[PDB]
Amino acid sequence: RQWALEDFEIGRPLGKGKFGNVYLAREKQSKFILALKVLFKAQLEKAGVEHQLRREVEIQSHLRHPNILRLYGYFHDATRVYLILEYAPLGTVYRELQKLSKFDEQRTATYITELANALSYCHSKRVIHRDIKPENLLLGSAGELKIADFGWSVHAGTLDYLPPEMIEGRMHDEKVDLWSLGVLCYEFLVGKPPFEANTYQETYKRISRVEFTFPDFVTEGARDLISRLLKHNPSQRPMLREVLEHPWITANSS
Ligand SMILES: CC(=O)NC[C@@H]1CCN(c2c(Cl)cnc3[nH]c(-c4cn(C)nc4C)nc23)C1
């Protein structure tokens, strides 16, 4: 199905980035509500990201899972490239995080469960996300989690969510998402990433040395899971099944 801009009525902007803006939109005939990502070919070309975008589309349009944001298709005109995406009605976990400041163990463990399932699927098709962060986590009509960017994803910057093996330029596989999963679990419970610093160069040393601390209110069950996920040695990180059956997950998820 080849598309065109004239098929859509454009609504409010949902996000304004440098690559481009994403708007609420409605296809005219079906009256289908969706999200339309508008990128500038010029702004694209001048950065040479024209490659992985094609890889982003190629990968995302093939993935079908309830916890992964769906890509319906795309098209381009004379001057722009448009990405037609599933619309997540409840916004980002990011905004949810800065409203509620922190999450309870129930909401946290539920997000981790949904995330692990989405990743397990992604890993089954040997796709790693690499850029798993709260602003890439969207929420569905039931408040379910939906992973939602793949513009820096491939087959097997901002340091906060990256693993030591990735920042130290080394070799990396599916185990990098397990690290990110731990960073998120911490952030969900605490309100900020475990390795947050005021400089890039300092966040680098925190990650490279695995230097994080727990505030008093983090329970042992959560401290244990996080400590298992945040291992410098990728091989020592738990499999997704082991995360899904962790006592603290089992006790608090839904
Ligand atoms: C920082 C930031 O905005 N990140 C999100 C990107 C922008 C829109 N994106 C969306 C995409 Cl790609 C799809 N659906 C969305 N729904 C929303 C939204 C935001 N609010 C406050 N309420 C709703 C509903 N956003 C999107 C991705």
Swiss-Prot record:
Q: What induces it?
A: Expression is cell-cycle regulated, low in G1/S, accumulates during G2/M, and decreases rapidly after.
The EC designation for this entry is: 2.7.11.1
Q: Which one of the record's GO molecular function terms can you name?
A: histone H3S10 kinase activity
Phenotype for F40A: Decreases the interaction with phosphatase type 1 isoforms
Tell me what the record says results from Q201A.
Reduces binding to MYCN
Q: Which GO terms describe its cellular component?
A: axon hillock; basolateral plasma membrane; centriole; centrosome; chromosome passenger complex; ciliary basal body; cytosol; germinal vesicle
Q: Which reaction does it catalyse?
A: L-seryl-[protein] + ATP = O-phospho-L-seryl-[protein] + ADP + H(+); L-threonyl-[protein] + ATP = O-phospho-L-threonyl-[protein] + ADP + H(+)
Q: What does its PTM field state? A: Phosphorylation at Ser-208 decreases the kinase activity. Ubiquitinated by the E3 ubiquitin-protein ligase complex SCF(FBXL7) during mitosis, leading to its degradation by the proteasome. Ubiquitinated by CHFR, leading to its degradation by the proteasome. Ubiquitinated by the anaphase-promoting complex (APC), leading to its degradation by the proteasome. Ubiquitinated by the CUL3-KLHL18 ligase leading to its activation at the centrosome which is required for initiating mitotic entry. Ubiquitination mediated by CUL3-KLHL18 ligase does not lead to its degradation by the proteasome.
Chain residues that bind ATP = K18, K37, E86, Y87, A88, E135, N136, D149
Its main subcellular localisation, reduced to a broad class, is cytoplasm
Q: Which residues form the active site?
A: D131 (proton acceptor)
- The residue ranges of the Protein kinase domain are 8-249
Which residues are reported to carry the modification Phosphoserine? Answer: S208
- The broad enzyme category this protein falls into is transferase
Which GO biological process annotations does it have?
anterior/posterior axis specification; apoptotic process; cell division; centrosome localization; cilium disassembly; G2/M transition of mitotic cell cycle; liver regeneration; mitotic cell cycle
Modulation of this protein's activity: Activation of CDK1, appears to be an upstream event of AURKA activation. Phosphatase inhibitor-2 (PPP1R2) and TPX2 act also as activators. Inactivated by the G2 checkpoint. Inhibited by GADD45A and p53/TP53, and through dephosphorylation by protein phosphatase type 1 (PP1). MLN8054 is also a potent and selective inhibitor. Activated during the early phase of cilia disassembly in the presence of CIMAP3. Inhibited by the small molecule inhibitor VX-680.
Its annotated compartments are: Cytoplasm, Cytoskeleton, Microtubule organizing center, Centrosome; Cytoplasm, Cytoskeleton, Spindle pole; Cytoplasm, Cytoskeleton, Microtubule organizing center, Centrosome, Centriole; Cell projection, Neuron projection
For this UniProt record, the keywords arranged alphabetically read as follows: ATP-binding, Cell cycle, Cell division, Cell membrane, Cell projection, Cilium, Cilium biogenesis/degradation, Cytoplasm, Cytoskeleton, Isopeptide bond, Kinase, Membrane, Microtubule, Mitosis, Nucleotide-binding, Phosphoprotein, Proto-oncogene, Serine/threonine-protein kinase, Transferase, Ubl conjugation
Q: In which tissues is it expressed?
A: Highly expressed in testis and weakly in skeletal muscle, thymus and spleen. Also highly expressed in colon, ovarian, prostate, neuroblastoma, breast and cervical cancer cell lines.
Q: Could you tell me at which residue positions the Glycyl lysine isopeptide (Lys-Gly) (interchain with G-Cter in SUMO2) crosslink is annotated in this chain?
A: K133
Outcome of altering K37R?
A: Loss of kinase activity
Spell out the note in the miscellaneous section: Centrosome amplification can occur when the cycles are uncoupled, and this amplification is associated with cancer and with an increase in the levels of chromosomal instability.
Q: Which family does it belong to?
A: Belongs to the protein kinase superfamily. Ser/Thr protein kinase family. Aurora subfamily.
Q: What does this protein do?
A: Mitotic serine/threonine kinase that contributes to the regulation of cell cycle progression. Associates with the centrosome and the spindle microtubules during mitosis and plays a critical role in various mitotic events including the establishment of mitotic spindle, centrosome duplication, centrosome separation as well as maturation, chromosomal alignment, spindle assembly checkpoint, and cytokinesis. Required for normal spindle positioning during mitosis and for the localization of NUMA1 and DCTN1 to the cell cortex during metaphase. Required for initial activation of CDK1 at centrosomes.
Q: How does it assemble?
A: Part of a complex composed of NEDD9, AURKA and CTTN; within the complex NEDD9 acts as a scaffold protein and is required for complex formation. Identified in a complex with AUNIP and NIN. Interacts with FBXL7. Interacts with CPEB1, JTB, TACC1, TPX2, PPP2CA, as well as with the protein phosphatase type 1 (PP1) isoforms PPP1CA, PPP1CB and PPP1CC. Also interacts with its substrates ARHGEF2, BORA, KIF2A, PARD3, and p53/TP53. Interaction with BORA promotes phosphorylation of PLK1. Interacts with CIMAP3. Interacts with GADD45A, competing with its oligomerization.
For this entry, the protein name equals: Aurora kinase A
- What gene is this protein translated from? AURKA
